[PDB]
Amino acid sequence: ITLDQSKPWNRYRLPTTLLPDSYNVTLRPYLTPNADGLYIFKGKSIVRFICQEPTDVIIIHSKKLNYTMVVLRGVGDSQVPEIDRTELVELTEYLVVHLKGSLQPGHMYEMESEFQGELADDLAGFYRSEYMEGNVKKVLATTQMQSTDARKSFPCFDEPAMKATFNITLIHPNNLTALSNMPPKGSSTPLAEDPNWSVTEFETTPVMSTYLLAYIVSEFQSVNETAQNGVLIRIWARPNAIAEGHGMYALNVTGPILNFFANHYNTSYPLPKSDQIALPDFNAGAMENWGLVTYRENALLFDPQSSSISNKERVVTVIAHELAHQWFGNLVTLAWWNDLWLNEGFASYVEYLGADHAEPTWNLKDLIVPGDVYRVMAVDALASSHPLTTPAEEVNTPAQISEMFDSISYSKGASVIRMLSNFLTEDLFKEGLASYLHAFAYQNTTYLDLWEHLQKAVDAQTSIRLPDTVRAIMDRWTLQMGFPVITVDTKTGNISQKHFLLAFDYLWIVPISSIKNGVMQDHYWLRDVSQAQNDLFKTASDDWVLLNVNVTGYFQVNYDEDNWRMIQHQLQTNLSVIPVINRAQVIYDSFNLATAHMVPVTLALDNTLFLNGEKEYMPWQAALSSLSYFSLMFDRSEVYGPMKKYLRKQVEPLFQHFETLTKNWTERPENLMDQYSEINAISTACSNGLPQCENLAKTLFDQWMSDPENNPIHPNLRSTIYCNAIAQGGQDQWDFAWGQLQQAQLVNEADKLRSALACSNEVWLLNRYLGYTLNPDLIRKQDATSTINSIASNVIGQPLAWDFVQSNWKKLFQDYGSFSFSNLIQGVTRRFSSEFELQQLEQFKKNNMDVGFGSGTRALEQALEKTKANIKWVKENKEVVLNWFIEHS
Ligand SMILES: *[C@@H]1O[C@H](CO)[C@@H](O)[C@H](O)[C@H]1NC(C)=O
Ligand SMILES: *[C@@H]1O[C@H](CO)[C@@H](O)[C@H](O)[C@H]1NC(C)=O
Ligand SMILES: *[C@@H]1O[C@H](CO)[C@@H](O)[C@H](O)[C@H]1NC(C)=O
Ligand SMILES: *[C@@H]1O[C@H](CO)[C@@H](O)[C@H](O)[C@H]1NC(C)=O
Ligand SMILES: *[C@@H]1O[C@H](CO)[C@@H](O)[C@H](O)[C@H]1NC(C)=O
Ligand SMILES: *[C@@H]1O[C@H](CO)[C@@H](O)[C@H](O)[C@H]1NC(C)=O
Ligand SMILES: *[C@@H]1O[C@H](CO)[C@@H](O)[C@H](O)[C@H]1NC(C)=O
Numbered sequence: 030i031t032l033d034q035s036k037p038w039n040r041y042r043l044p045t046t047l048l049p050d051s052y053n054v055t056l057r058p059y060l061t062p063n064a065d066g067l068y069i070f071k072g073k074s075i076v077r078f079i080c081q082e083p084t085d086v087i088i089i090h091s092k093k094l095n096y097t098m099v100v101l102r103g104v105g106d107s108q109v110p111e112i113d114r115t116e117l118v119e120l121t122e123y124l125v126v127h128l129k130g131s132l133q134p135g136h137m138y139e140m141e142s143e144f145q146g147e148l149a150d151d152l153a154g155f156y157r158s159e160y161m162e163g164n165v166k167k168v169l170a171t172t173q174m175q176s177t178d179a180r181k182s183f184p185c186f187d188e189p190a191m192k193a194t195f196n197i198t199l200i201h202p203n204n205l206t207a208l209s210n211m212p213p214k215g216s217s218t219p220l221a222e223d224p225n226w227s228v229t230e231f232e233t234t235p236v237m238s239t240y241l242l243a244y245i246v247s248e249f250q251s252v253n254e255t256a257q258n259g260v261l262i263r264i265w266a267r268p269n270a271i272a273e274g275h276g277m278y279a280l281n282v283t284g285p286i287l288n289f290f291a292n293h294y295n296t297s298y299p300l301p302k303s304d305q306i307a308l309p310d311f312n313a314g315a316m317e318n319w320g321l322v323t324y325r326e327n328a329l330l331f332d333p334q335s336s337s338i339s340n341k342e343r344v345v346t347v348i349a350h351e352l353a354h355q356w357f358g359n360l361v362t363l364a365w366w367n368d369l370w371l372n373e374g375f376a377s378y379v380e381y382l383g384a385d386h387a388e389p390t391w392n393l394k395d396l397i398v399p400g401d402v403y404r405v406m407a408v409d410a411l412a413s414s415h416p417l418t419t420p421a422e423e424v425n426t427p428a429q430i431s432e433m434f435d436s437i438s439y440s441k442g443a444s445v446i447r448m449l450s451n452f453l454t455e456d457l458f459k460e461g462l463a464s465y466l467h468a469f470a471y472q473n474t475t476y477l478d479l480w481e482h483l484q485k486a487v488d489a490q491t492s493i494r495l496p497d498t499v500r501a502i503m504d505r506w507t508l509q510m511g512f513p514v515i516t517v518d519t520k521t522g523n524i525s526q527k528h529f530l531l532a533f534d535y536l537w538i539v540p541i542s543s544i545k546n547g548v549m550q551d552h553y554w555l556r557d558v559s560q561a562q563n564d565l566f567k568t569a570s571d572d573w574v575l576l577n578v579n580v581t582g583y584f585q586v587n588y589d590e591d592n593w594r595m596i597q598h599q600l601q602t603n604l605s606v607i608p609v610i611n612r613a614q615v616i617y618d619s620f621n622l623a624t625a626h627m628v629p630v631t632l633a634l635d636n637t638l639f640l641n642g643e644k645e646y647m648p649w650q651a652a653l654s655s656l657s658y659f660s661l662m663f664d665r666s667e668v669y670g671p672m673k674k675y676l677r678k679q680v681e682p683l684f685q686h687f688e689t690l691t692k693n694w695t696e697r698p699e700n701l702m703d704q705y706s707e708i709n710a711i712s713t714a715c716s717n718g719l720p721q722c723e724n725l726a727k728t729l730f731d732q733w734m735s736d737p738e739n740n741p742i743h744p745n746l747r748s749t750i751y752c753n754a755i756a757q758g759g760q761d762q763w764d765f766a767w768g769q770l771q772q773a774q775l776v777n778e779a780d781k782l783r784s785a786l787a788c789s790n791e792v793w794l795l796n797r798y799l800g801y802t803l804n805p806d807l808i809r810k811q812d813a814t815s816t817i818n819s820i821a822s823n824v825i826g827q828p829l830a831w832d833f834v835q836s837n838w839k840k841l842f843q844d845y846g847s848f849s850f851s852n853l854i855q856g857v858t859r860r861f862s863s864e865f866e867l868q869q870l871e872q873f874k875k876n877n878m879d880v881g882f883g884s885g886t887r888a889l890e891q892a893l894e895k896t897k898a899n900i901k902w903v904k905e906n907k908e909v910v911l912n913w914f915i916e917h918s
């Protein structure tokens with residue numbers, strides 16, 4: 030359905046003729062439904078804007094708002110044109126006011142409107158969340174504006190670069206607390222018409238993007254602390270959660286992290302307070318609204334009793350991430366969404382800095398490697414991938430904007446920034462960044478503003494030298510999709526680079542670390558050249574070399590056979606000579622190379638042989654997610670049996686190691702890494718049928734059922750023990766776990782049960798479960814997508830979920846963009862390896878082509894591309910893979 034752009038109201042980007050100065054917004058949520066089912070809110074809003082250039086039309090964003098139509102006033106006296114007519118243009122989400130005369134440049138105007146909207150179970154705009162306290166049902170009102178939902182709350186020019194000051198008022202019941210970005214201005218006052226309602230006015234915001242606005246009406250309480258910089262910190266949640274002390278851990282790390290960031294970047298946090306609030310219904314993990322940060326309960330709340338170590342790492346990490354946005358993205362904002370990584374890439378990298386400071390003994394910084402680097406490479410190796418910075422004119426529609434919210438902007442951004450930091454030295458990097466923040470505070474930026482400030486810092490200094498300007502290096506990482514594979518011929522010292530695939534010509538300037546028989550060598554820079562030679566990369570005799578120590582650069586390395594064998598021999602002899610992270614890398618890169626058909630698949634499998642004597646977290650993690658792909662390809666085939674037998678063989682000694690160290694699973698390992706390694710160990714043993722593990726799970730889960738009130742199972746072990754107990758059992762185990770889920774007060778516990786229920790081997794149980802997935806009384810809309818994905822991951826659940834998604838698609842499309850919908854498509858299609866399944870996917874697309882795929886559109890394309898690649902890969906490799914596992918088991 031095309032629009033003719035001759036009309037500016039048919040265009041997706043706002044005109045540049047009018048700029049907002051400030052807003053007054055008054056909102057009134059009605060927390061009881063009217064006389065059918067409907068919860069609504071009422072609003073009144075006034076925008077003050079300046080006319081930059083003459084125009085006879087006023088165009089602002091408005092979505093799903095009903096008007097009760099508008100009033101235009103000149104500031105003081107500028108005479109003002111009369112209003113001719115006023116219309117809503119739905120597709121493009123505009124309220125359009127046609128004038129009988131033109132506004133004049135330099136003049137200011139105020140436009141006033143009253144409206145009404147649904148407080149939907151939407152999770153977008155102004156919406157309702159619900160929960161239980163005792164036997165009473167509670168409703169609260171909350172916001173999610175990013176990326177373009179502000180317009181769903183009140184009329185505004187809803188684009189990130191048009192920054193304004195906001196004066197917010199909330200009209201709410203006497204006994205409910207009203208929160209916003211700023212603290213309250215003075216006291217609440219009774220509503221004139223109805224003294225049971227109160228009017229709460231908030232202090233003016235600093236100059237700010239609309240997508241950062243937040244307002245909340247609830248019965249929540251807080252615990253509070255002042256941070257070292259004088260900023261007031263509060264943690265808000267459900268009264269029972271606060272009282273049970275679930276907000277304490279968040280209170281411990283928040284101020285310290287906020288203060289760390291202010292010092293590290295030499296930029297003070299400008300607001301008087303920063304509120305953190307845990308919401309029962311929320312779409313993403315967390316949202317960075319300036320002064321009031323919103324989280325899912327599982328990203329904020331922590332119970333040291335029933336919460337996992339993973340849950341705990343998730344809390345500091347999400348908090349750090351959200352605080353980082355106070356600087357990157359709030360104080361300084363991207364000019365437009367094609368640049369999303371200037372916000373998200375930065376927060377994704379600095380989250381690790383912040384989290385490391387709050388938890389210095391964890392060694393978090395390493396998690397960025399499996400957690401960001403190798404996660405995104407799988408996707409960034411597609412021809413359908415996109416560069417960090419896409420061209421502005423290619424991002425227009427709301428769905429295209431939501432699509433920018435993918436792993437490229439987050440994880441590749443973080444990766445590439447970690448590389449930049451590493452070759453600059455964070456000390457130098459942070460100076461450049463402080464200069465960029467101070468220069469651009471309360472304004473917007475493009476990637477070019479970033480480089481120029483980094484360049485300035487480099488220029489002012491001597492010790493660090495670059496082969497080129499920061500821009501020449503970074504433009505190649507920023508403006509072209511993908512990453513190079515770097516190939517080393519170890520006999521001659523030839524080194525080359527090639528775009529890794531399943532205007533700069535796909536050449537990068539690549540910083541290269543190396544290690545020779547375990548000792549550091551001089552750093553090296555590969556310029557943008559397809560090949561070069563250096564004696565750093567030449568080995569003699571039995572020596573070996575490894576490139577990209579600690580996987581600091583974003584790229585993968587392939588060697589000649591003989592070096593590979595040397596590495597392998599080293600892993601058998603003393604694996605400690607190789608840095609633990611690079612041990613993981615030899616695995617990730619092996620498998621990725623085998624996947625892309627650039628090395629025989631037996632190389633990857635052979636690199637798996639030493640895991641025999643590996644107790645460290647990361648190399649196992651590398652194997653697990655690498656083989657995860659084989660699992661997706663082969664778990665329906667004859668490869669599967671031998672493959673499981675092999676993993677049992679490899680995993681067993683690690684499992685025994687932990688049994689002993691852990692004293693019959695009574696004591697938990699000391700450090701985080703080792704705890705992670707124990708969790709992977711048990712998980713792998715059970716998934717693969719280690720009898721000792723399956724016995725453990727059955728015994729423990731059985732003990733739990735006979736005494737529901739005391740759960741015998743340590744939280745770290747729960748995901749694995751629940752899953753396997755349910756897998757081995759039947760309706761009794763399932764109904765028990767379901768009863769636990771329905772009454773569960775801790776979200777972490779609920780999440781573990783939700784995934785475990787998806788492990789049943791009975792088709793009828795899984796299909797019934799899918800049914801529950803669409804009932805909001807049973808599964809909250811925010812959990813529906815991940816629940817369906819859990820079921821799809823079950824090999825027996827695969828066809829159930831695929832059929833369910835196809836037949837429920839219309840329904841699923843209206844409700845459940847922002848990242849879940851795309852995850853649904855990706856999750857159900859991961860296994861398609863055959864032409865028949867490919868045709869199936871094509872048919873699905875064709876059948877639904879009318880009502881589109883929305884924010885999942887690009888996900889569907891990548892699903893198709895990958896499927897095609899799987900078919901070719903699976904036919905080529907299955908004989909070899911099968912034979913290999915047979916021999917080695
Ligand atoms: C909001 O409040 C500030 C401070 O009182 C004021 O200067 C600004 O003009 C107000 N915005 C309006 C009235 O749109
Ligand atoms: C916005 O709010 C402030 C506080 O009530 C007020 O001073 C100002 O007049 C309002 N702006 C209008 C009515 O345009
Ligand atoms: C918006 O108006 C439409 C049609 O007039 C109506 O269906 C809906 O109830 C309204 N939403 C409100 C009043 O919140
Ligand atoms: C607020 O008042 C309402 C209506 O009586 C009540 O349902 C709710 O429990 C109250 N919340 C409080 C007192 O925190
Ligand atoms: C919160 O901080 C206090 C002081 O360090 C501590 O007693 C408590 O263990 C912390 N809660 C955690 C780490 O979950
Ligand atoms: C710190 O920021 C101040 C300006 O607020 C500036 O004077 C100084 O150069 C900055 N120093 C560093 C090391 O970033
Ligand atoms: C975006 O930022 C630039 C400075 O980088 C500023 O001059 C411009 O006014 C900003 N755009 C808007 C709409 O404010």
Ligand SMILES: *[C@@H]1O[C@H](CO)[C@@H](O)[C@H](O)[C@H]1NC(C)=O
Nearest residue numbers: 395542549578579608609610
């Ligand atoms: C690589 O990482 C380890 C920790 O995993 C660290 O101790 C070592 O110093 C790092 N090596 C380099 C060259 O940064």
Ligand SMILES: *[C@@H]1O[C@H](CO)[C@@H](O)[C@H](O)[C@H]1NC(C)=O
Nearest residue numbers: 547602603604605606607608
């Ligand atoms: C393994 O190599 C490391 C040095 O990387 C050394 O500390 C250790 O002693 C070696 N182990 C043996 C058995 O030689």
Ligand SMILES: [Zn+2]
Nearest residue numbers: 350354373376
């Ligand atoms: Zn973010």
